Amino acid sequence: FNPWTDAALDTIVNQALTLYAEMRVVPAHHDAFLAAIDTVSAKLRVLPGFLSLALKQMSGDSTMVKNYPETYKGVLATAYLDGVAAGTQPYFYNLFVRFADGRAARAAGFEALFETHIHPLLHAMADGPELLAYRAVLQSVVAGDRHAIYRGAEEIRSFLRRPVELPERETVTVENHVMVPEDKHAAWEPQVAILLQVAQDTFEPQDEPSGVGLPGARDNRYYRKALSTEILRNAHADGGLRAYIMHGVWESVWDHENSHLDPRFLAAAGPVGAAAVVGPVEPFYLTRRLVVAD
């Protein structure tokens, strides 16, 4: 069940494809792991049809995605960073490798690169047990930012060529993970797309003069607009379930959490959340590497 093999990759084509991994890395292997990612990204960036690569460290967990009462807002905002600072958790890293189309993805030989450079570092200490990675191939269904919604294959490629999450900007990424019944997913996708209009348009206070909003805080309901939103579908159903990630980038944890309290968002998300039979789980991430094509 490896979706990164030649054969798996043969089965898919004319749109952006993301090779995607969720990994755990222990401190003893961390420096080597980042060196390995840098070795791998140098090799990938020069390949035909390569768009971007993002390495994101899980930093906390959204509570407002669950619609807990506002007293719980942001209480796990930095909890994963704290686990690294306590040594109680490994590093959790997700990797996004975006290609122009299936031919580019297929040609890239990513599985080999991963096996050579990254796989050997994904073990605990003794040496110890292998920490298994989640692996997927993901399609970008629809995407958007503060100015426009991107629906065509080429418009979405272009969006993926200019990621906003440059590490030095200290943006906060969210990945809202859900599974929808496979027999419902086609009908559901158009409902999800209204979330991109909400993301493009909504902020608090609504009259903020720069047209972006004010920074969120624990003690207010303000927020700046999302920086970017992208709907990722797993290219392969998991039997009767289809996995999605609503991939968002925000200026801060508080902007995100406060966005979830806005009645405009709640009204639009209600119907979308109705079809989710697993999740939502929506962690926070910091972008540790961002690499674009040469």
**Which parts of this chain interact with Mg ion (CB under 5 A)?**
65, 282, 294
What is the nearest approach in angstroms of Mg ion to the Cβ of residue 87?
29
Q: Which tokens go with 1?
A: 């069940």
Is 251 annotated as contributing to ligand binding?
A: no
Is residue 282 a contact partner of residue 177, using CB atoms and an 8 Å limit? yes
Distance CA(101)–CA(122), nearest Å, equals: 28
Residue type, 198: V
Return the residue nearest Mg ion (CB atom): 294
Residue 251 vs 282, nearer CB to Mg ion: 282
Q: Tell me the residue length of the chain.
A: 294
What is the nearest approach in angstroms of Mg ion to the Cβ of residue 257?
8
Residue 65 vs 172, nearer CB to Mg ion: 65
Residue 58: C-alpha distances to residues 101, 201, 253 (Å): 28, 27, 13
What is the nearest approach in angstroms of Mg ion to the Cβ of residue 186?
23
Residue 30 vs 103, nearer CB to Mg ion: 103
Is 6 annotated as contributing to ligand binding?
A: no
Residue 3 vs 248, nearer CB to Mg ion: 248
Is 282 annotated as contributing to ligand binding?
A: yes
Is 182 annotated as contributing to ligand binding?
A: no
What is the nearest approach in angstroms of Mg ion to the Cβ of residue 61?
11
Binding site per annotation, positions for Mg(2+): 256, 260, 282, 294
Binding site per annotation, positions: 256, 260, 282, 294
